[PDB]
């Protein structure tokens, strides 16, 4: 089943953010150098690239329904570009500190940004990118934000304060706070996308990945094996696997039922920072960004 092939890999400066376009065979990379690139990974030709800033751009997503990309950087700013024309649609200071993570609501015109300023902010692009809410309560850098795809009126924030908080849009306190026991903090949080399990997953500098039942708050499993900071861990949308990546230079694929490692890949680009899975499992594509570039893999 698992038959991993390299679709396209290219070298670049450190890739901190990465995302797939849902209908074009494109991947967006956002770099530590302030540059962002959109690649057609089937033709292996650049669609568009932009020197956005001189600071790191840690976060970037497509907003395909608007033909946009949205990026956030260490200069504190969110910028949005039309990927067909190159037009800079908006450019604003979002936080008084680094932006770590951006999430886009699946149907409503909302973007979340998580920041070193200890907050998550909600922006509405149908209201001139107005700040509609600030979510306060975390006590260290907010490293990752993610909507619950099964109920995107709620979202999770993962924080170096060692917690995940789950929030409701329009409400000022978390529905709950998970104490992860990941004492070096949480770098990443993700939701299992299918209706049969209320699961989330967290990755930490403490070398662990943990699976959580968000209804009971129980830790279902702890996945050990990475040898340095775990940058991310995600559930694949269609295959029964979890995919993680680490500053140890490896991607790991784990069985999502037994939680045992199935495959370890060192693709030779040094530290791994970010991950994307194709929205619809097209060719079972995944992509990861590293110190020295990115790779797009077909898993089977």
């Amino acid at each position: 089943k698992l038959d991993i092939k390299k679709t396209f890999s290219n070298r670049s400066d450190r890739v901190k953010g990465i995302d797939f376009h849902p209908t074009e065979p494109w991947v967006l990379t956002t770099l530590y150098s302030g540059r962002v690139e959109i690649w057609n990974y089937e033709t292996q030709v650049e669609v568009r690239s932009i020197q956005v800033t001189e600071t790191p751009v840690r976060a970037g997503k497509f907003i395909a329904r608007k033909n946009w990309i949205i990026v956030g950087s260490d200069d504190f700013r969110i910028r949005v570009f039309n990927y067909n024309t190159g037009e800079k649609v908006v450019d604003f200071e979002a936080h008084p500190d680094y932006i770590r993570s951006i999430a886009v609501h699946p149907t409503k015109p909302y973007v979340l940004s998580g920041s070193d300023d200890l907050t998550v902010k909600l922006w509405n692009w149908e209201n001139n990118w107005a700040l509609e809410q600030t979510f306060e309560g975390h006590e260290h850098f907010v490293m990752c934000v993610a909507f619950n795809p099964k109920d995107p009126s709620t979202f999770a924030s993962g924080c170096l304060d060692r917690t995940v908080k789950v929030w409701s849009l329009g409400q000022s306190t978390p529905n709950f706070t998970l104490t992860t026991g990941q004492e070096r903090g949480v770098n990443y949080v993700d939701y299992y996308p299918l209706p049969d399990k209320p699961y989330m997953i967290t990755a930490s500098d403490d070398l662990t990945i943990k699976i959580w039942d968000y209804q009971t708050k129980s830790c279902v499993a702890t996945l050990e094996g990475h040898m340095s900071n775990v940058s991310f861990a995600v559930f694949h949308p269609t295959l029964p696997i979890i995919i993680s990546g680490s500053e140890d230079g490896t991607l790991k694929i784990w069985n999502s039922s037994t939680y045992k490692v199935e495959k370890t890949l060192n693709v030779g680009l040094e530290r791994s920072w970010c991950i994307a899975t194709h929205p619809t499992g097209r060719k079972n594509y995944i992509a990861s960004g590293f110190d020295n570039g990115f790779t797009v893999l077909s898993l089977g």
């Binding site: 450190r14 680094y98 070193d116 850098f141 490293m143 170096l160 500053e247 530290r271």
Partner: peptide, 5 residues
Amino acid sequence: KTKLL
């Protein structure tokens, strides 16, 4: 600044 990388 922690997590500068």
